[PDB]
């Protein structure tokens, strides 16, 4: 956690429904956006920490 990895995700199609429909995640809390409309919206860059 002190040296958390940051991966910049760009120039691809991000399928968020695979993550949302998984039952393997204990917490899937989204702040500032809703999971339902993630699969439609488009973003400049994604930061994965």
């Amino acid at each position: 956690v002190y040296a958390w990895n940051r991966k910049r995700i760009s120039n691809c199609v991000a399928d968020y429904s695979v993550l949302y429909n998984s039952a393997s995640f204990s917490t899937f809390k989204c702040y500032g956006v809703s999971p339902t409309k993630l699969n439609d919206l488009c973003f400049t860059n994604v930061y994965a920490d």
Binding site: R8, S10, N11, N45
Partner: protein, 35 residues
């Protein structure tokens, strides 16, 4: 020998090669609306 460092990358794209004088290559480069 064209560069010495690369620090912060935002975009990478790898594609198929584009290429008496025998060949004539014409290119047009435009910057419109961030495209």
């Amino acid at each position: 020998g064209v560069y010495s460092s690369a620090n912060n990358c935002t975009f990478e794209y790898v594609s198929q090669p584009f290429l008496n004088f025998k060949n004539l290559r014409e290119f047009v480069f435009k910057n419109i609306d961030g495209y």
